[PDB]
RNA sequence: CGAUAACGAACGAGACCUUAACCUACUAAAUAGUGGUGCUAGCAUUUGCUGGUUAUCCACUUCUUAGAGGGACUAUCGGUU
RNA sequence: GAGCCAGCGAGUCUAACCUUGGCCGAGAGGUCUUGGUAAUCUUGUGAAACUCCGUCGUGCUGGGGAUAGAGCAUUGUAAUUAUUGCUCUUCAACGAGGAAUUCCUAGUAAGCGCAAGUCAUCAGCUUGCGUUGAUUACGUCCCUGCCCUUUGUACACACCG
């Protein structure tokens, strides 16, 4: 049964899947000092799902946290206060 | 906007119907882990239980979970309209039935063996493992084993 | 670091053995008067601008 | 009176001058009409291959019919009537009346 | 009676009737004004013509524009066509010709399409293959 | 100046009247709902399961506006979207007839729509005096 | 400036941008200077446009996508890879958040960002194959100013296209860090990559 | 084209025919389509906006359709042989 | 979930084809009427890709839907080696593919559907048609074929001589 490929796993992460008090300060903490904010970078920053990270970007813009540019569906597009 | 503190009831594992459902999914993908169950059902049940279906699986309470499993084992007097089940009208029994997790797998060997057992064309193709729905076995299923 | 540009002053035709490739006469922008000929791989005109990556060469033919 | 001819023909130039006879002795009589009303011609493509046997290489044919259909209304006593349908009918062409 | 000039823009299969009289200034497409035109991106494509000339030659003519054909992305292109044309059609039967230049020098500097259709037609399919070029596949062996 | 159902844009006013359903409360919802996934071809019921009837109510609302008259089996072609043959390629197939065929007498009810002469269903003059009201109320919203 | 009110009402943002200048969806195209003697001709900016998806022939003479915006040239490598193959409004969709993200990202303008990463991403000397006989041979010679912007747009595309596949990451910010990390120039950014990586090869061969 | 013991033609290529693209130029049309005027609906209210209507009828051909025709011949200019 | 737009075409009478609309049914379907021998009716063939908002969140995963089990319908004298359609359940290989190799120069390649042909029923096929629409080149004889010139010939059913 050859294959002739190779066929490597990778580490997958495991990233959170459910909001506690400490993932909970770290956002309030640091999402300023980011210039640029949306779904992908709070995933690689702060290891939660692309859930978490759509819910808490609509949380934050309306009582104040991030300014927004563009509110297109699929990629939102945030710049911080300064 | 609802940013919401989860506690430390929280489960990574939980066990309906002898299978280990997985957590940190929604409730509803979840619990097709179980055999017998699949997504569209799974739908009905958690909508049928009245749970709110945007609920991770470990963060649900110990009486909604036990409420959805009654549900599903007794589907059509919770008023499921009974086409949506698995194996109704039912070969001996004539009754609408759905099995579950292990009723599927022994079942379907059972119904499998009356036509072995009658010697029915479908049944002889099952025991030498050949295709039986009327399919060309000229080229594909090769390497099947 | 050297490097120089190049005007193209008269594009001489295709050499290379599948033909992908051109001689050309090019000019010097600083140091004009000096003229040599070399090769360019793409589409290429004339009054275009080579940076030529050093200038102390030159190809005639491609066999 | 409200009659109307029809024609349905597939060759062009003698559906025109078929056509065009019926709306100039028209002219004569000084009868009201709607002039002709071109409908879209409707081509009937047949496309089958070349070769009767199923060898060679597949070529393929699209034999074609091209049907041209116009239509005058008319209003005019009888006797008009029967003379203009009575004559102008030439091989090929297909005309047929109907009334209101 | 009152002034007006009727006008058509095209693309591959679509075609946008344009009638352009005198009135108060409302730009309509369909019935719904021009701000409502779906595909968000080309939107801002079909405001350049206007754009491009200045809104003070809108203020004195109502536009309806009514769009059949083709596909989605085609209708928006015969829409602005339609109007473009439409507005140096008005300047040309009823303003000086002297508007009309100036309109039309605009336009065609920016895109020339604007007042020139699109001459690229589909070219048909032949049998041998799935499209107009290509062939199915040739195996030798 | 006469705002109409023309002068708004399609999404939010079909979800500003759809929202006036909700709190309203008289539509007569079918009562197979939620049960349903109302298109032959589709995969999954709708997700945004507490609503939707009172979605396709304000869907199905604008569209005889617009329009003269419809049936349920233009309805069907509307909704109908391409159903994976599974293996196969896809293929056009029409939506659920009942929903199209009970929203549309569960619109007869309030009053919206009416039966229509040469068959199908058109705008009542009820239903061309809300319809314009709501349009008014939705776009003054970002102003 | 004065605003003009007519019976359609049309919003005031856009009706700004009819007399002022004639830019882009947002930025303008002055102050877009291309700084490399060679790449200028051939990279058509100071004739402004507002949106990336013109269409366009150019596919006629030899030259003609020299004239081309190239914005748009930006967007027309974006449709590839085969299920992406059409889908123009897909394309013009993410260019436009991929210009939102450079300049939040660097606060200067996007689609200077733009121009000066293809200026860097041009392979300036290339290898072409000769036989030899049995051991195929190089040689190295020189590009075209125009197949050098052609290279660099290619070169970025399939840099941004493999990063953000299999990956949480949108192909919108994908694009643009590659974008931002050419115009710089890194050697971490995929397209500068594979340039001096040419370059070392034409080098062997001098 | 040129050289030139060859000159001048024929078939094939080309021409031809079909089709697609242009025509506010002609001939015309509720089985194509606008605009009005009747009859109405809704919203405003100024002098408007959007619809519905087949016996309201009067005019129209831009768009739709096909008859006859026109139009491109690489025209004009520049470069190089 | 919401928006929402083509073109090529086919269709029954001494027959029962294309089917609108109303009603029943989750569906596939059933039933009562109607229009059409057709620029008139199906039919704006409201096609799909696409567009806008939402759930998913790098997990062989809500990717993929093969292979199996029960029922409900439709065509047909008849459907078991399941005709086809629908529901529920089961939910495999496959993480872009070695040597090899095909097609292609602009409304073209590629994506995406629809009609027609075969057709009582059955399209993953073909012939066409639209929709969305690139990159690259505007060369050469390097490879593979074909043509021509010069040349040698003891060949001429002509080098398989
Ligand atoms: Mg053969
Ligand atoms: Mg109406
Ligand atoms: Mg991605
Ligand atoms: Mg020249
Ligand atoms: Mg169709
Ligand atoms: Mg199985
Ligand atoms: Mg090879
Ligand atoms: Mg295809
Ligand atoms: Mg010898
Ligand atoms: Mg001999």
Redesign the interface.
């Given at each position: 049964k050859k294959k002739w490929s190779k066929k490597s796993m990778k580490d997958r992460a495991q990233h959170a899947?459910?909001?506690?008090?400490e993932k909970?300060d770290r956002i309030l903490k640091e999402v300023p000092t980011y210039?640029?904010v949306?779904?992908?970078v709070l995933?690689?920053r702060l290891k939660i799902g692309?859930s978490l990270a759509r819910?808490?970007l609509?949380?934050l813009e309306?009582e104040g946290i991030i300014k927004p540019?563009?509110k297109?569906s699929?990629?939102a597009?945030?710049?911080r206060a300064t | 906007?609802?940013?919401?503190?989860?506690q430390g009831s929280?489960q990574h594992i939980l066990r309906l119907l002898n299978t280990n459902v997985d957590?940190?999914?929604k409730i509803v993908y979840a619990l097709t882990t179980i055999k017998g169950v699949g997504r569209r059902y799974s739908n009905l049940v958690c909508k049928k239980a009245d749970v709110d279906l945007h609920k991770?699986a470990?963060?649900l309470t110990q009486e909604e979970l036990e409420r959805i499993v009654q549900i599903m084992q007794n589907p059509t007097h919770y008023k499921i309209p009974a086409w949506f089940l698995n194996r109704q009208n039912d070969i001996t029994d004539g009754k609408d039935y759905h099995t579950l997790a292990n009723n599927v797998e022994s079942k379907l060997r059972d119904d499998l063996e009356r036509l072995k057992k009658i010697r029915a064309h479908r049944g002889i193709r099952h025991f030498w493992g050949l295709r039986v729905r009327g399919q060309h076995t000229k080229t594909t299923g090769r390497r099947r084993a | 670091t050297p490097v120089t540009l190049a005007k193209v002053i008269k594009v001489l035709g295709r050499t290379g053995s599948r033909g992908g490739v051109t001689q050309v006469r090019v000019e010097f922008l600083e140091d004009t008067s000096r003229t040599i000929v070399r090769n360019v791989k793409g589409p290429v005109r004339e009054n275009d601008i080579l940076v030529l990556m050093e200038s102390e060469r030159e190809a005639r033919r491609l066999r | 009176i409200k009659i109307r001819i029809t024609l349905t023909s597939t060759k062009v130039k003698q559906l025109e001058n078929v056509s065009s006879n019926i709306v100039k002795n028209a002219e004569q009589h000084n009868l009201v009409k709607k002039g002709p009303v071109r409908l879209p011609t409707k081509v009937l493509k047949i496309s089958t291959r070349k070769t009767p046997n199923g060898e060679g290489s597949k070529t393929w044919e699209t034999y074609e019919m091209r049907i041209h259909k116009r239509y005058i209304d008319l209003e005019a006593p009888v006797q008009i009537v029967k003379r203009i349908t009575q004559i102008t009918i030439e091989p090929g062409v297909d005309v047929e009346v109907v009334v209101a | 009676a009152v002034p007006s000039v009727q006008t058509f823009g095209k693309k591959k299969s679509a075609t946008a009737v344009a009638h352009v009289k005198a009135g108060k200034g409302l730009i309509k497409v369909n019935g719904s004004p021009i701000t409502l035109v779906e595909p968000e991106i080309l939107r801002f494509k079909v405001y350049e013509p206007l754009l491009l000339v200045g809104l003070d030659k809108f203020s004195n003519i109502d536009i309806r524009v009514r769009v059949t054909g083709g596909g989605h992305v085609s209708q928006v292109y015969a829409i602005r066509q339609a109007i473009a044309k439409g507005l140096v059609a008005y300047h040309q039967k009823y303003v000086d010709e002297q508007s009309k230049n100036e309109l039309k020098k605009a336009f065609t500097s920016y895109d020339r399409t604007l007042l020139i259709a699109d001459s690229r037609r589909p070219e048909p399919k032949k049998f041998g293959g799935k499209g107009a070029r290509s062939r199915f596949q040739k195996s030798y062996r | 100046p006469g705002v109409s159902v023309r002068d708004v844009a399609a999404q939010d006013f079909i979800n500003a009247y759809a929202s006036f359903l909700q709190r309203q409360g008289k539509l007569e919802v079918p009562g197979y709902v939620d049960i349903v996934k109302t298109s032959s071809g589709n995969e999954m019921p709708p997700q945004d399961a507490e609503g939707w009837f009172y979605k396709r109510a304000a869907s199905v609302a604008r569209h005889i506006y617009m329009r003269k008259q419809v049936g349920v089996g233009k309805l069907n072609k509307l909704y109908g979207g391409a159903k994976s043959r599974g293996v196969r390629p896809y293929k056009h197939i029409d939506a659920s007839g009942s929903i199209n065929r009970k929203v549309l007498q569960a619109l007869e009810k309030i009053g919206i729509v009416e039966i229509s002469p040469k068959g199908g269903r058109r705008i009542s003059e009820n239903g061309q005096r809300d319809l314009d009201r709501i349009a008014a109320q939705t776009l003054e919203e970002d102003e | 400036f004065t605003p003009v009110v007519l019976a359609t009402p049309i919003p005031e943002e856009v009706q700004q941008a009819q007399t002022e200048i004639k830019l882009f969806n947002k930025w303008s195209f002055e102050e877009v200077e291309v700084k490399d003697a060679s790449l200028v001709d051939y990279v058509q900016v100071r004739q402004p446009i507002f949106v990336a998806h013109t269409a366009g022939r150019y596919a006629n003479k030899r030259f003609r996508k020299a004239q081309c915006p190239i914005i748009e040239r930006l967007t027309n490598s974006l449709m590839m890879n085969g299920r992406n193959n059409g889908k123009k409004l897909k394309a013009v969709?993410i260019i436009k958040?991929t210009l939102?993200?450079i300049n939040?990202?660097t606060d200067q303008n996007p689609i200077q960002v733009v121009v000066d990463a293809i200026t860097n991403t041009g392979p300036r000397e290339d290898t072409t194959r000769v036989g030899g006989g049995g051991a195929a041979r190089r040689q190295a010679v020189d590009v075209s100013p125009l197949r050098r912007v052609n290279q660099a747009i290619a070169l970025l595309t399939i840099g941004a296209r493999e990063a953000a596949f299999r990956n949480?990451?949108?192909i919108?910010?994908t694009l643009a860090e590659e974008l931002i990390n050419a115009a710089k120039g890194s050697s971490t950014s995929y397209a500068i990559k594979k340039k001096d990586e040419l370059e070392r090869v034409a080098k062997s061969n001098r």
């Open positions: 899947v459910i909001l506690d008090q909970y210039r640029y949306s779904v992908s995933v690689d692309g819910i808490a609509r949380h309306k540019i563009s297109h699929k990629q597009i945030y710049t | 906007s609802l940013v919401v503190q989860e929280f957590g940190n999914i991770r470990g963060e | - | - | - | - | 969709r958040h939102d993200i939040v990202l949480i990451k949108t919108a910010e």
